[PDB]
């Protein structure tokens, strides 16, 4: 079967490097254990190495950004006519699932409360202005977290009445 | 303003290597019909770079397997030596394997040996060690994971001379403890060896 063949497999990134040519046989690629192949260009570049198995990725970020949650990484067998160790056919992945916990901190975010009553007019003559004022704790937030919005508002109160 | 064409699939690069594949070149450079004061250029494709193919296989170099498992620790003409004090040896093999075509050996020494203190299938006395650092989700991607942490009876051992001396030279080697013993302690949570809490994960993501 025909596949593109590398010059360079560079290690610890799974790329194929330095393209050599295409269409050449797997058999004729690999004579020369440096090189790399990649059959169908979608993916799976895989090194003219014996089969063993590569290096563990990093961590997949925490399913859950609060509490006790899980994290993944793989590690694909890597190599051609061979088995790895444990009767593992090449191509095969293997996972370790590890409970993470990014913080302590679980909904940071307030929501407003009820209103309270209006206030009366700041001046008993002329014009002035009038505010409304509420609480942001129901719920409370917790951490650094804010009510999203203004905490009062603010409009024109007329009094109808000469100084 | 000279019209340039193509000169010919050139003369060939010799294979440049004895082994496996290689890529020579010749392209057709536009060498016969050169283009000259920017006017027109070669029209077509310059390209050919080709895959040479040498029918012999290069050499791959051996690299080392793993350490193996440790030989039973005996001494010669000295029945069992288990639970006393009586210095033995013990063996460690591995395998160069892989190395085809006349490739390069393995650069080191394929046996380790040290010096050793039998204390397979001896009691004695334990002491039980502090909560582990939690485990693995085992089986990962399969039916409900769980965690695992365990306290287990440690056994003490026992306080022997930690060198011996040679018979041919007088510097001093080391001596190892090797066995599994039988740890003998108070009971926690009604287990003699070990006890262990499973607690199952949470949030599994798909594989
Ligand atoms: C038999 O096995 C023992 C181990 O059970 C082995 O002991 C080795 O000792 C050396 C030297 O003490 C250790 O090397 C150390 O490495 C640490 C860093 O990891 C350094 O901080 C140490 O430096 C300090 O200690 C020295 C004396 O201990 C001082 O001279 C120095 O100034 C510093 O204070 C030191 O370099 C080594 O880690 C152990 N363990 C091994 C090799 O597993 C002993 O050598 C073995 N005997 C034989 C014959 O093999
Ligand atoms: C990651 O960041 C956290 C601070 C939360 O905002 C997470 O949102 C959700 O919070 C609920 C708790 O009420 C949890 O069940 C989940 O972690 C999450 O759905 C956010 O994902
Ligand atoms: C309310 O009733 C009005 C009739 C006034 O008597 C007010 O007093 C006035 O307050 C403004 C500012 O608050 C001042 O400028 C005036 O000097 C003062 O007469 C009263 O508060
Ligand atoms: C031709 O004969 C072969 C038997 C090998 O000895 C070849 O040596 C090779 O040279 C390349 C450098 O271009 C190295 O990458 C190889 O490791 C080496 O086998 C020789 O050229
Ligand atoms: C993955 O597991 C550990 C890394 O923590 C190493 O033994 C090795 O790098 C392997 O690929
Ligand atoms: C995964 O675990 C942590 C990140 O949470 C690091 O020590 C490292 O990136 C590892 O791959
Ligand atoms: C203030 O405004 C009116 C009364 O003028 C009402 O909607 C309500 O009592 C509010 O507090
Ligand atoms: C045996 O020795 C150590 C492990 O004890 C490593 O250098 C390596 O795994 C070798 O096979
Ligand atoms: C021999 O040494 C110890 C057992 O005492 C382990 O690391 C392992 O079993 C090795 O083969
Ligand atoms: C473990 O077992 C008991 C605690 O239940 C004690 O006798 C002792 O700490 C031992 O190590």
């Keep these: 079967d025909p596949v593109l063949c590398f010059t360079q497999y560079e290690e610890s990134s799974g790329k194929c490097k330095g393209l050599l040519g295409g269409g050449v046989s797997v058999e004729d690629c690999c004579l020369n254990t440096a090189f790399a192949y990649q059959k169908r260009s979608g993916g799976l570049c895989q090194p ?36 790895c160790s444990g009767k593992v056919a090449p191509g095969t992945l293997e996972w370790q699932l590890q409970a993470c916990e990014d913080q302590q901190c679980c909904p ?34 917790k951490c650094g977290g804010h009510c999203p919005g203004q905490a009062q508002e603010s409009e024109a109160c007329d009094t109808q009445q000469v100084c | 303003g000279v019209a340039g064409g193509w000169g010919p699939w050139g003369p060939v690069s010799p294979c440049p290597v004895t082994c496996g594949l290689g890529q020579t070149m010749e392209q057709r ?17 310059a ?7 040498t029918a012999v296989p290069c050499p791959v170099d051996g690299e080392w397997d793993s350490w193996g498992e440790w030989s039973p620790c005996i001494r010669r003409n000295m029945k069992s030596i288990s639970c ?5 040896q013990q063996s460690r093999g591995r395998t160069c394997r892989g190395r085809k075509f006349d490739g390069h050996r393995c650069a080191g ?73 039988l740890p003998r302690c108070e009971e926690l949570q ?14 599994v993501p798909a594989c």
């Design chain 1, 48 to 83: 003219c190495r014996s089969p063993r198995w590569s290096l563990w990725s990093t961590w997949a970020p925490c399913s859950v950004t609060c509490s006790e949650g899980s994290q993944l990484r793989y590690r694909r067998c890597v190599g051609w006519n061979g088995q």
């Design chain 1, 108 to 141: 940071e975010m307030g929501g407003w409360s009820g209103w309270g009553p209006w206030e009366p007019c700041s001046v008993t003559c002329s014009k002035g202005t009038r505010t409304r004022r509420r609480a942001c704790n129901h719920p409370a937030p």
């Design chain 2, 29 to 45: 450079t536009c060498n016969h019909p050169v283009p000259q004061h920017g006017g027109p250029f070669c029209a077509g494709d």
């Design chain 2, 47 to 53: 390209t050919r770079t080709h895959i040479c193919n």
């Design chain 2, 84 to 88: 006393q004090e009586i210095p033995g």
């Design chain 2, 109 to 181: 020494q394929q046996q380790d040996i040290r010096h050793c203190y039998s204390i397979q299938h001896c009691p004695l006395k334990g002491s039980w060690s502090e909560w582990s650092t939690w485990g693995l989700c085992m089986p990962p991607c399969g039916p409900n994971p769980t965690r695992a942490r365990q306290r287990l009876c440690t056994p003490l051992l026992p306080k022997y001379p930690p060198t011996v001396s040679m018979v041919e030279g007088q510097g001093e080697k080391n001596v190892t403890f090797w066995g599994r013993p």
């Design chain 2, 190 to 203: 009604g287990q003699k060896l070990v006890v262990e809490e499973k607690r199952p994960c949470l949030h």
